[PDB]
Amino acid sequence: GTSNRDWWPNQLDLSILHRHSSLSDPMGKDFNYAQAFEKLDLAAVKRDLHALMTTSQDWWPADFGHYGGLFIRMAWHSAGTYRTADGRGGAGEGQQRFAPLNSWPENANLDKARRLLWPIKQKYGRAISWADLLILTGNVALESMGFKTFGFAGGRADTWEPEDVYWGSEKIWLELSGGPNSRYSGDRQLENPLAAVQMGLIYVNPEGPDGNPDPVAAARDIRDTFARMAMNDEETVALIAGGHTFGKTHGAGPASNVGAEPEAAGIEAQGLGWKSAYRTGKGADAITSGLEVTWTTTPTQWSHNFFENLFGYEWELTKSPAGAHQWVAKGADAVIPDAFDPSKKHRPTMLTTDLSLRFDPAYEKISRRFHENPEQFADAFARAWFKLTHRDMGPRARYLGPEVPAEVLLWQDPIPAVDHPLIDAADAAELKAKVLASGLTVSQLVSTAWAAASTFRGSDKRGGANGARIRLAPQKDWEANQPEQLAAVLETLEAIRTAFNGAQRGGKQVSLADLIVLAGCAGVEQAAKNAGHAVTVPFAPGRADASQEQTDVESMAVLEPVADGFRNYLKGKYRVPAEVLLVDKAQLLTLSAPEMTVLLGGLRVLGANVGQSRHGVFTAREQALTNDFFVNLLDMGTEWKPTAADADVFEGRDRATGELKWTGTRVDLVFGSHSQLRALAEVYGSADAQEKFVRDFVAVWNKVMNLDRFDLA
Amino acid sequence: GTSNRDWWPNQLDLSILHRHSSLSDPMGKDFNYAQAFEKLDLAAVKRDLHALMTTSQDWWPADFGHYGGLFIRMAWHSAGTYRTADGRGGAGEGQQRFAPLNSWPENANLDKARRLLWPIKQKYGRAISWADLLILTGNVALESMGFKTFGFAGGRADTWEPEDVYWGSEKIWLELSGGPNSRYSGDRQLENPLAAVQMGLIYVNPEGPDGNPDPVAAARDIRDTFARMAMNDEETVALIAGGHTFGKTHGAGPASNVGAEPEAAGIEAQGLGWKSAYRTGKGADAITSGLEVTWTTTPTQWSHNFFENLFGYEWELTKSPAGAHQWVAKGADAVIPDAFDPSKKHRPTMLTTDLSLRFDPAYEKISRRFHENPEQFADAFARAWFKLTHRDMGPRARYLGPEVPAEVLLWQDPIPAVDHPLIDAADAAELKAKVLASGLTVSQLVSTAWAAASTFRGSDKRGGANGARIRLAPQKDWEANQPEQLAAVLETLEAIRTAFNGAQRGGKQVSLADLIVLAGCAGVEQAAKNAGHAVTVPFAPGRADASQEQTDVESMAVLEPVADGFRNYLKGKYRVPAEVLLVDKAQLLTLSAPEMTVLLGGLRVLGANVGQSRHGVFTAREQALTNDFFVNLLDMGTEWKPTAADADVFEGRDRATGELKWTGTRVDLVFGSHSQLRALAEVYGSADAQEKFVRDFVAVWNKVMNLDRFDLA
Ligand code: HEM
Numbered sequence A, B: 001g002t003s004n005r006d007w008w009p010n011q012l013d014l015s016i017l018h019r020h021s022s023l024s025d026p027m028g029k030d031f032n033y034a035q036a037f038e039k040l041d042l043a044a045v046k047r048d049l050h051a052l053m054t055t056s057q058d059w060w061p062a063d064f065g066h067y068g069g070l071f072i073r074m075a076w077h078s079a080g081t082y083r084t085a086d087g088r089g090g091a092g093e094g095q096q097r098f099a100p101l102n103s104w105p106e107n108a109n110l111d112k113a114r115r116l117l118w119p120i121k122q123k124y125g126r127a128i129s130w131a132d133l134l135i136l137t138g139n140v141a142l143e144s145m146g147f148k149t150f151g152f153a154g155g156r157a158d159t160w161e162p163e164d165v166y167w168g169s170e171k172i173w174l175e176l177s178g179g180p181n182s183r184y185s186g187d188r189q190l191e192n193p194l195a196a197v198q199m200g201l202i203y204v205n206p207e208g209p210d211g212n213p214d215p216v217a218a219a220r221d222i223r224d225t226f227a228r229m230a231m232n233d234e235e236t237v238a239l240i241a242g243g244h245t246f247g248k249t250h251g252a253g254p255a256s257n258v259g260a261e262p263e264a265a266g267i268e269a270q271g272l273g274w275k276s277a278y279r280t281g282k283g284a285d286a287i288t289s290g291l292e293v294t295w296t297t298t299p300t301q302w303s304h305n306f307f308e309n310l311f312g313y314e315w316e317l318t319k320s321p322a323g324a325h326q327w328v329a330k331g332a333d334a335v336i337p338d339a340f341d342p343s344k345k346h347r348p349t350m351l352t353t354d355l356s357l358r359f360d361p362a363y364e365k366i367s368r369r370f371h372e373n374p375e376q377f378a379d380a381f382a383r384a385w386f387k388l389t390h391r392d393m394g395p396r397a398r399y400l401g402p403e404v405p406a407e408v409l410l411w412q413d414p415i416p417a418v419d420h421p422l423i424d425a426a427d428a429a430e431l432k433a434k435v436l437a438s439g440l441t442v443s444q445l446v447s448t449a450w451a452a453a454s455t456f457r458g459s460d461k462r463g464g465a466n467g468a469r470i471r472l473a474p475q476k477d478w479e480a481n482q483p484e485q486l487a488a489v490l491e492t493l494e495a496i497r498t499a500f501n502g503a504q505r506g507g508k509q510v511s512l513a514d515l516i517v518l519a520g521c522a523g524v525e526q527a528a529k530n531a532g533h534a535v536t537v538p539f540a541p542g543r544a545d546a547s548q549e550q551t552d553v554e555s556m557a558v559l560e561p562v563a564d565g566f567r568n569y570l571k572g573k574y575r576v577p578a579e580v581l582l583v584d585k586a587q588l589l590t591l592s593a594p595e596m597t598v599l600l601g602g603l604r605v606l607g608a609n610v611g612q613s614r615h616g617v618f619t620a621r622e623q624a625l626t627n628d629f630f631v632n633l634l635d636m637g638t639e640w641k642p643t644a645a646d647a648d649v650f651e652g653r654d655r656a657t658g659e660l661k662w663t664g665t666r667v668d669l670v671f672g673s674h675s676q677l678r679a680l681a682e683v684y685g686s687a688d689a690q691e692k693f694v695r696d697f698v699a700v701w702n703k704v705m706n707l708d709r710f711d712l713a
């Protein structure tokens, strides 16, 4: 059945902006998951999960009579797809249950684990999401096996279709690096935004880099991938040794016995996959990864036996029954229990990637410290586990239920509690007029607010104007934010705020975060008035000002907008065309294509471009809010050609006279080229549309201003 | 970027049910196109279109000084993608402006035609859709050139993304038959639902079948394709000779001069394509098809010269300047004017496909008759043009504006005007009670109403319960409708109706069409009561009963549901898997995935399966409206396997004992296999979902009952 993707494979795909519509959602339009969750008897869910842990089902018998290890792996894979570069992946949307993640090789037999949870999901229904349940099950597995977690927050609403994520360009599952779609270049440099070493892996290859069983080299990949998931060395060691305190791997026979992954299996498999022809295909005969390693003498109980074994033996390279490289303890007794036969025991074994924790010099120090101080190991693992499973959930205001930890952590980008009365409508109007009487222009006001609010990304719910982090390092020094200009605008706004705040009674004050946004709204109102329209831009107060000490400078780095088509900005030259990067940014901002289109057209004519570039500024009334961008873009009396100096800049000349009328980038002209975007541009570029343009612009502006306002949900 | 389509190319694509969401739509949720159109100054639009006709632009100069021919082609391509098999394609959604149709080879340079219309589209804005505009421009071109049209209706609302249409499986533009994805098998048998001979053509190849210039063979393709677009021999001859009374083809130089189609062109092309390196690239040097034919001595005026030339000369095979086969009049003078140079004249020429009209025996008689009786030709062409351009618009109630013809035509599947008082809520309650006291079962009531209503398709807005066409030929004889049983149910309903009607005052009566639907609603209410719920099903009266004479038995044939997954019915063995056919049917019914899911689960347990088949009937309380389908489907205590005798039937057995619990088809089990569908099934199969199931079912039932109710829109 031949499609548009087949005919025109490099044409821009707008469908990623139109997912998660009300059409695909089986819940009412009014369904509020937070409110369903807040009535969940969470204690009763955990008791059921507790019982499930030791209630073996014959279709996937429990190793050692306890599902704990399997469910921990389940919950770590749900969290483990996360990338700090774009915030995509992680546990927060329950995506492990949809394609492609449900069928990745490294997710093999997690289909069994999810199926085991259906009876409990079915019992509690909409009051607990799959997304929350996966994580909660991992916590309960840990608890049942004697490990006290740091806490748990609910709130991850389920989604109903696959997320659109760039996982890599390889066409072969698990392809070794150096192929025609190599995710590596230079000195083993992993391309952004990826955070895994091969297509269909979580982080690294457990045999070692491209299957080469060198723990030292494996450690480099571990450190790189984990850094790309926002985890440092201490956290990494704690997670890997923590996880591999429990359970086992499965490689009881050759991998060629394993059939089709879930998305490729027959209909009769009812959503399960990796059906195995090896002996019983399950339990004692299970094959998952191809490795056959059991790390500890008590795989169903928390202990410090991972590090006792790691350091207490010397290790020899060997092969599993499926031919995978793995390691066995030299001269050891048979001390490790068998998963099904009480009369058999086995020698201690390890993965190459476990040995990384001893043979990398920086990890070795952390590992020794954790070996000598198992209470520090426990505490670090608890904290890292919470971070792992919550890193993509967003501000603490989204956190639900009775196990939310009270400690505020730096990676949460925390925002102080508001401790005073808020400005009211009359105050907002007074502040807007003061902003406009200061002499700040429409362009300055719009640009600064855009810069502050457009750091949000819906992928992990980080960023936005709350916190006023634009005044702090590193945001205040980002090139896209024009640091010298930004500093002068911030200083003027701070004087207005100090004057407003000094005049108040009863403790009422306004935050800089709120005033930045409100100043932007005044800019947009003034632009509308300059075009002859009377509109009020909505504004919701309640943002607070975060401190530098509450702002991790390194974790903020990934929010830098190295491409921002809405300001016609690109920091350098990329492999990816700028229009694709625009659509990527729009998706992170949660915008539809009509939203993206309105917002861009408006921003152009308001002067929001970085460096005051005239590219795409298709108006003779700059700083008035009109649909001139569209009217001019769609004017057939202009002919467009790439410049001689730069193929990515275009000159628009009068077709009759040859006179230069405009310049534009790829991001500008895509709205006149792409057949779906041009259809949208046409709507806003019609003679009846100026009022619609203004109203839709103001709505989308307000939307962007409020993206991080989970205090108002 | 590797996608789910790349990994699992045969997996079912649900995104077709979630297109055209409010997300991709730039108009408000409340935008009503009918109301915008009803305030259009239609007269003013036509005047501007009249002016456009002779206002030549230098970037695509007008042949003979008049764009009429180009615009007629543009309108006839807009209409000409239509397929009677599924109702997809046609002019009614303005899809010519989107991929792929904007870039089909046979639509070359229609991008120029559409761009010529932008200023008028821009001036009238949302009050005239592109879809309406394309057709209206065709009409105006005809009128400008002396041809009186039969009429015009507005109301085709614009769409905002590509429609999901199976156009064929070929991976090469214009691929000749017999390839690895041949749309032909057997004795030149074109696969349903296709209605074109090669990928990227409208109907046939103008050079002849697979490029072989045999007019008699070409005629067979013409007859087959046009029948597949709902046109008979008289209509076909009138359209082809009518259209080719105007304008000319373009093949001034080799086709290798012509560059990328619009979707492949550079961004600076601003949505246009097929840029040509031959001489000026345009006007006198234009290359569109590669053929160079001008049919008449007055290409910009209606005449009877097509048939004078066809019959008045003998024809010789020659080649255009691009190498294409075409025909030239033997021994003729140079009587045909040049499009740009007053000092040149040309011999009459014809396409192979024009000669079909003379050399096919059945067409020849029609052609002679039109030659001898030019008034009959004019009238038939006017009618056929109206049909061509309105065949996919639906019932007359959707027709807008002041040029709607008053004559009622058979292909509009007309329904008589209601001329009596309608039943009220008290009458509805009394009729429902009588239906239930008659002894008709839930299963009969539900099945008959489903059968009546589910012939609707949103592609061309044909079908539905209005008209009570289920009681007429051919619907009453379709195997899916179970003729024996249907006749028994209809006879009982007719007695109820006769008794109700005979008791009324003041002319009040109920139609059979209304009573069928109402009786279905009573069945659903009864089913709900059998499950312990108190449910009133909404009902809107106002359907009327069509006669057999108003119901064309051949055009109804395409509405036969040879696959209806909602009744677990498949008429024979098809190359397309049954779950794909289910999704196809859901798309035609305008159902989202959640709607399809709820609806099918409900229908299964209410006894709507054809032949009383137990496949998918996963309940022990048949004819009670419960979510049993889902709860039993998702039961992991059951293992499923295909049967020995039939790979498309599955047996579900107890995993512990091996006892047979259920059987199901592919359509049943796909809800437990496909990861997105299973996610939906889980919602309805949860412990908290019984009430939600019942209420969502009733909503979707009502939706289906009302699909064709454009009298209420
Ligand atoms: C370098 C990082 C990691 C690698 C390469 C890795 C690799 C693997 C492999 C290949 C398996 C065996 C799958 C099977 O055959 O059943 C597995 C099992 C497991 N891993 Fe990891 N792992 C890593 C990090 C983690 C982390 C961060 C956690 C949790 C905090 C975790 C917890 C587990 C658990 C609990 C199992 C046991 C599954 C069972 O009992 O069925 N691992 N690991």
Ligand code: HEM
Residues within 6 Å of the ligand: B063, B068, B069, B070, B071, B072, B073, B076, B203, B204, B205, B206, B222, B239, B240, B242, B243, B244, B246, B247, B248, B249, B250, B251, B287, B288, B289, B290, B291, B353
């Ligand atoms: C067997 C069916 C038909 C075939 C194979 C066919 C083929 C074509 C071809 C190849 C062209 C030349 C394209 C170009 O080079 O510019 C063309 C032109 C045209 N056809 Fe058809 N045609 C068909 C039916 C129709 C019908 C039903 C209509 C309208 C009622 C129509 C009206 C036109 C007109 C007006 C033009 C001239 C365009 C211009 O002047 O620019 N044709 N036809």
Ligand code: NA
Residues within 6 Å of the ligand: A087, A088, A089, A090, A092, A392, A459, A460
């Ligand atoms: Na994410």
Ligand code: NA
Residues within 6 Å of the ligand: B087, B088, B089, B090, B092, B392, B459, B460
């Ligand atoms: Na259609």
